[PDB]
Design goal:
Chain lengths: 669, 131, 223, 131, 111
């Protein structure tokens, strides 16, 4: 009869009779009319007022007025208060509803087998009291938690052995047998139909949850709204009145609230993660577009002010929970989140440090809840990665930095991975001394891990402890690490890997420690050369060092010739030849033997012989790796500027990457 | 594009599958931190480059599953040789798995999920070697 | 009016031969054409005379009175359940046609694929083997074929137009990005034929039927 | 935000609603068929402005329903609560009644749908008037 | 009209394409009358070309360039006083705005 819009207003839809719903809102402002009812009838009106206002129902659509409203989530589970859940489980049992909250907290905490048993006890005790609602929801939630444990062991059975280094069996084989027996011939589709009818006519609004594909009406509406919003963004239309971006923003909160409230286990489901991920990523896209919007002569003045959308605490949790690190990168490369204001930052930092202490407890005391760990590491990573966009206090940063460099398992966060996230935290606020102390302890801990003497620093990004020293030296020009300094006296050509460690950790070593190192241990192979330049130890191409480069370059031709006969073409991404060429491109190294080498690497041939290099094989992605000064002063010379200009002109219209656009604007003018 | 996840220790295949996505990330975060920016006496040119490869239907050979740092090796062949054809064997000497839990379960099925692993680098950047 | 009357004869004469599907599809089709008539008269008697200027009355008032007579209090969600049990277990493939929101599972997969495609193309990922931008093309072809075969009237609805319009626009956008892409040392054109995607006859009619001048214009300005 | 839709030279109210989508698409100089290119006698060709605008919930006049080219205006005093001054009466006098059928039927009737419409032009370009 | 518009207290900016071409004519020197320079306030584009030196660039709209052909943009290119201002606004709105027309305008000029 009446359509309740997500904004809060109502509108007649099929009410062909008296406007009772409008009459209810007609009495909303008239004080005396309410008193004209019977005492019980007036009492019911008061109860409906409490229900409607809590649920966000607002007055009639004619009396619209201001309609901006911020929703709130009173559920502790959504806030990730894992410490509160632990004591909430052991509070005995007051009522079935209280047990229902315990079971949902149990599932979120990771104790799924206990949660499943709790859900089993709920349905048995729900015969009377006409409380089928909690029985209905627990029945679905028991099915969902039954589904979750089946894939959990399946992941441990498959894809789990290699990721964790061994097999984990958080659930006994008997429990896996028990759960499937109780779930035999259970089709959830007819659960609403196959359950007493007095529920069927009263709780009709819950019929949309019975089907397994219950996350379809909202996603379809989101998908249609996403298309509607994207049409406005491309066309530049000004959304007068209620705008779809506000609509989708409200819809996800209602969906988020309705599921985290009432203790629905589907909040952890990937489709819900997918639902929120696409919901907010659209919002970020339009927020970036609104900031980067042409100020047209018409329709410039409208309801939306300057920076109409603000990043709030609730959005941060959703971003930190329903996103993965790669999708966040796609959001970053598409929209600049640093420009949009982050509201209630102080209400976010305690959440970030709160997630840090849970990480600290998991990986320091005894073992870790692996079933919970899989369900938590994604949220844990997403929160810390996104922390770059929020200002944090010294105390807040210290706990997070301690968590980042001391507790994350290497299986999900390697040595190289931490540095990328470390730089994000360091860029937001200037590095204080307290953070450096934690960083220093991290490096010395890795040195002591060499007890087995077969551990090698292996990183995904290719960045090693080499970069940690560079960050320290960049922020602290003079810094000496005593702990690494003292270690050198005890080591006398015993651990070669630990010996190699000191070379790339030189700027943090003392004068005596550095003297003892180079006394009879120094550069012998080409690897230590560029390491020294980054360290700063090697500053000039000494005659002996230039011999080392060409000697290694000679080896490559041996394989290069033989591989051509059989058709092979080895292209190992060492990029050392590119480093040799760029040095020669400024004739900083003037050996002619390496100039003879040609046809080896496309980038290498570019630097050595610029004019006669075959530009048809040039790749624009190499330009992303180049310094500033060489590009800046090369303008106007035109000996080799014009050749790359054709590539430069192509990229601005072919590619939407801002980095290519920046290069052609700052230089080549 | 059938991949063969080999083992670094012995060479026995951990599993085999077919490639789904191979993302070579082209993005450098310019931040004036790397290199010798304190004094700048030479050039380095060692920007980090990221390679990822995901599959869709693993095999999980039983001999490795008996015992209840890792590599891979694959070939790429198209019957339409046309005018250019090559025996391209993309392989990274050190790749570590990075598959999340990825429990969707709304459709009710998972079958073989998307196994995503991230390549690594040890000493010199020997990864992304086509050999 | 003739189509409604004719569809009444199909269901009326389908009593024998235990056809089931022909009666069931025509019954669903009868609701669809009746649904179109409901807003047809609503856009002629209502909306005043804005797009046209003269009050056209294609259907008589008597015809409006009768069609509502039989069509009053009709719910399409229970039509499949209202079918005989023998038909239910025999033609279960058509179980989702009864639902009014049947254009949801197909759109969800397309929406799921669109997010996957958009994320894939932002990172420069290469869809080896089963390319995620071809399955969406395969999905819409089956949806277009199945809807147009068996003579279903739902193909003329706006919700189905949205399904094709969003699905086909993504294909154009993906094909635009594929050709207009950077070259990687490892991401070479080993055997890809550059754009690969080519506008066939069946692709043009989809664009020429479900798109709109407003919708197509932003497509041109973007690709 | 409200729309008053009147018949020009007749003054009868057509319907009232709220505008939701406002488009002010700018002219594009890409066609190259503008003319007067090689000679270039005088730059006279100005912007071929295109503007589209829709409404939310039309309520047609009952009197206008009896007898069964058109102007239009709006009201907006929301920015900075400047209701006594800075009045903007968005006046396209010759708005074209447009719109498509769009049989959805999977949501039911939503009172009046989104009516498409655009402002036309005349001998003198009077597309938009703030007063 | 402009002076009497203050009688009701409301200013007028009518999107009618008369004042726009007048400044272009003066910029192209197709008109050499000193009387028309006294008219300031009616159109932002009119003040942009009639009196570019004292024109308030805060009211500049980047969409104006998309309307101008290559010659008009070429003529306004490199005037030693517009050149400085047009470059600054273009650099700001080539990253914020991803329209291909803006990219073409910046590439045909200041090479």
């Amino acid at each position: 009869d009446y359509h309740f819009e997500v904004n809060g207003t109502v509108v007649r839809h099929k009410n062909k009779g008296f406007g009772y719903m409008e009459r209810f809102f007609e009495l909303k402002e008239s004080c005396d009319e309410r008193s004209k009812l019977s005492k019980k009838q007036y009492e019911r009106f008061n109860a409906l007022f409490n229900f409607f206002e809590k649920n966000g129902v607002i007055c009639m659509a004619k009396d619209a007025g201001t309609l901006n409203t911020s929703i709130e989530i009173n559920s502790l589970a959504y806030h990730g208060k894992y410490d509160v859940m632990k004591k909430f489980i052991e509070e005995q049992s007051v009522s079935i509803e209280d047990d229902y909250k315990k079971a949902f907290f149990l599932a979120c905490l990771g104790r799924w087998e206990e949660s499943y048993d709790l859900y089993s006890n709920i349905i048995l005790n729900s015969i009377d009291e006409s409380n089928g609602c909690v029985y209905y929801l627990s029945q679905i939630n028991r099915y969902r938690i039954y589904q979750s444990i089946t894939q959990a062991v399946t992941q441990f059975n498959g894809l789990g052995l290699l990721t964790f280094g061994r097999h984990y069996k958080p659930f006994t084989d008997e429990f896996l047998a028990r759960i499937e027996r109780e779930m035999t011939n259970f089709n959830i589709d007819d659960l609403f139909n196959g359950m007493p009818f007095e529920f069927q006519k009263k709780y009709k609004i819950l019929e949309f949850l019975s089907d397994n594909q219950f996350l379809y009406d909202d996603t379809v509406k989101l998908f249609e709204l996403t298309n509607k919003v994207r049409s406005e963004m491309s066309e530049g239309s000004y959304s007068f009145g209620m705008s779809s971006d506000i609509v989708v923003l409200l819809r996800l909160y209602d969906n988020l609230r309705f599921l985290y409230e009432n203790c629905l286990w589907s909040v952890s489901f990937h489709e819900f993660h997918q639902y929120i991920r696409n919901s907010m990523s659209l919002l970020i896209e339009k927020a970036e577009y609104e900031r980067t919007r042409d100020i047209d002569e018409l329709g410039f003045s409208f309801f939306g002010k300057k920076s109409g959308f603000f990043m709030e605490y609730y959005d941060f949790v959703n971003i930190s929970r329903h996103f993965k690190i790669d999708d966040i990168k796609n959001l970053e490369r598409s929209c600049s989140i640093d420009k949009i204001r982050f509201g209630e930052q102080e209400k976010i930092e305690e959440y970030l440090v709160g997630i840090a202490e849970e990480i600290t407890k998991q990986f320091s005391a005894n073992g870790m809840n692996v079933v919970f760990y899989t369900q938590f590491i994604s949220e844990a990573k997403a929160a810390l990665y996104f922390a770059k966009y929020v200002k944090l206090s010294e105390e807040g940063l210290g706990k997070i930095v301690k968590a980042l460099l001391f507790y994350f398992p290497e299986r999900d966060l390697d040595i190289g991975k931490r540095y990328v996230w470390l730089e994000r935290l360091t860029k937001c606020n200037e590095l204080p001394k307290s953070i450096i102390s934690i960083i220093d302890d991290f490096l010395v801990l890795q040195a002591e891990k060499h007890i087995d003497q077969n551990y090698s620093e292996v990183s995904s990004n290719g960045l090693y402890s080499r970069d940690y020293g560079a960050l320290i030296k960049h922020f602290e020009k003079n810094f000496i690490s005593k702990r690494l300094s003292e270690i050198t006296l005890c080591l006398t050509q015993d651990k070669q890997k630990q010996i190699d460690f000191l070379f790339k950790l030189l700027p943090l070593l003392s004068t005596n420690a550095k003297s003892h190192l180079l006394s009879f241990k120094s550069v012998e192979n080409i690897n230590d050369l560029m390491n020294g330049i980054r360290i700063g130890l090697i500053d000039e191409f000494t005659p002996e060092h230039e011999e080392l480069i060409i000697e290694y370059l000679e080896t490559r031709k041996v394989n290069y010739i033989v591989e051509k006969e059989k058709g092979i073409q080895t292209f190992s991404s060492n990029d050392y030849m590119s480093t040799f060429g760029i040095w020669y491109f400024l004739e900083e190294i003037n050996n002619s033997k390496m100039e003879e080498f040609i046809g080896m690497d496309d980038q290498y041939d570019f630097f050595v012989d610029p004019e006669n290099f075959d530009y048809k094989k040039f790749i624009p992605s190499w330009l992303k790796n180049y310094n500033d000064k060489l590009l800046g002063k090369i303008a106007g010379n035109k000996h080799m500027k014009h050749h790359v200009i054709e590539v430069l002109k192509e990229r601005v219209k072919n590619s939407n990457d801002k980095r290519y656009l920046e290069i052609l604007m700052n230089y080549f003018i | 594009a059938d991949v063969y996840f080999k083992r670094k220790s012995d060479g026995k295949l951990v599993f085999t599958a077919e490639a789904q996505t191979a993302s070579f990330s082209q993005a450098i975060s310019e931040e004036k931190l790397r290199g010798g920016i304190g004094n700048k006496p030479l050039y380095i040119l060692k920007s980090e480059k990221e390679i990822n490869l995901t599959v869709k239907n693993a095999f999980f050979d039983l001999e490795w599953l008996a015992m209840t740092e890792v590599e891979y090796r694959t070939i790429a062949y198209n019957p339409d040789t046309e005018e250019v054809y090559s025996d391209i064997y993309i392989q990274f000497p050190n790749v570590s798995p990075s598959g999340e839990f990825e429990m969707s379960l709304e459709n009710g099925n998972a079958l073989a999920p998307e196994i995503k692993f991230e390549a690594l680098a040890d000493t010199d950047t020997d990864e992304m070697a086509v050999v």
